[PDB]
Each structure stands twice: as C-alpha cells, then as structure tokens.
Amino acid sequence: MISLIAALAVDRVIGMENAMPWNLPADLAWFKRNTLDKPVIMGRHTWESIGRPLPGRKNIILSSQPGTDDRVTWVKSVDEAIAACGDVPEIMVIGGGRVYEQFLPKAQKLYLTHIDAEVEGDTHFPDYEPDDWESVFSEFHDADAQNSHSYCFEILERR
C-alpha cells in the first residue's frame, strides 16, 4: 500500500521557493507520528529543502542524477523507488509536487492537513477527483499560542 502525506494551504498550495511558508509544530508532530518506522519517498527538491536524513525512516530520494549522499537511498524511477521499500505494509510518499502527481494514481490513502493560511506559492498538491475518496478521519484544531493557524487533519481512503 502506498499513501501520500501532505500539508495544504488555501488553493492546495504546498510550497514556495523550495520552502514551506508556515510553522505549525502540531502538524510536524502529526507528520512524524504517521511516518516513523516506515519508508519515505521524496523528490530531490524536497530532499534539499529538508536538508538532512529523517531519523527512524528509510529515506528514498528520486533523482534522474546520481546520488551525492550515502546516508539515503537514491533511485531513478517510480518503480525502483517502490521496489527499494521492500515488503512493508505502508509506503509514505512525502512530496513534493511532481512526486505527488506521479504517485497519486497508485495511492490507497491520503493523509492531508488543511491549513487555514493564505500563502502565495509556486507548488500545488495535485487536483484529485473527490468522488474517488472517502473521508475516514477528520479532526479540527483552532489556532493557539504554538500554532498560528487553524488546521484540520484528514485521512482519506480510495473507495
């Protein structure tokens, strides 16, 4: 099973100038909880924006170019990325935009955080067909002293 996990601002914005223009520690805790002890697949731009290996996860990077860091696994196609994960229950795809686009057709689950923030962006989550997905979990949170915006955690499963 393949799952996507992402945080979306208004209009499905997910990034700007290779960074995320918000700080929501609650969402990062959610990200960590849902990805720990699982392989994570990311594109090269996302690897660069993160800047180091994510601990306690097998880090797999998609690049058409040879790898430049042996602390992570480098693969050159979607099929190789999947094979590199082995036989695990759940593979987590952590973006960015181009990688989300390619793995969406294969995904059975989406872990989405909807953030009530208006940000200009240059990267967007794919336009997924809402009829194909069932919402099985949602949990809304108002803003607080640590999290500057309200946000909703949602898990959707392909029908």
Ligand X SMILES: NC(=O)c1ccc[n+]([C@@H]2O[C@H](COP(=O)([O-])OP(=O)(O)OC[C@H]3O[C@@H](n4cnc5c(N)ncnc54)[C@H](OP(=O)(O)O)[C@@H]3O)[C@@H](O)[C@H]2O)c1
Ligand Y SMILES: Nc1nc(=O)c2nc(CNc3ccc(C(=O)N[C@@H](CCC(=O)O)C(=O)O)cc3)cnc2[nH]1
Pairing of strands 39-43, 133-141: unpaired
Q: Provide, rounded to whole angstroms, the least separation between the CB of residue 143 and Mn ion.
A: 7
Residue 70: name its binding partner from ligand X, ligand Y, Mn ion, none (Cβ under 5 to 8 Å by kind).
Answer: Mn ion
Q: Provide, rounded to whole angstroms, the least separation between the CB of residue 151 and Mn ion.
A: 9
Backbone Cα Rg of the chain = 15
Pairing of strands 2-8, 13-15: unpaired
Pair of tokens at residue 25: 């520690």
Please report whether residue 98 would count as binding ligand X according to CB under 6 A.
yes
Query: Was 18 annotated as part of a binding site?
Result: yes
Pair of tokens at residue 68: 């430049």
Phi, psi of 46 (to 5 degrees): -65, -45
Q: Which residues bind ligand X (CB under 6 A)?
A: 6-7, 14-15, 18-20, 42-46, 49, 62-65, 76-78, 94-99, 102, 123
Q: Which residues bind ligand Y (CB under 6 A)?
A: 5-7, 20, 27-32, 46, 50, 54, 94-95, 113
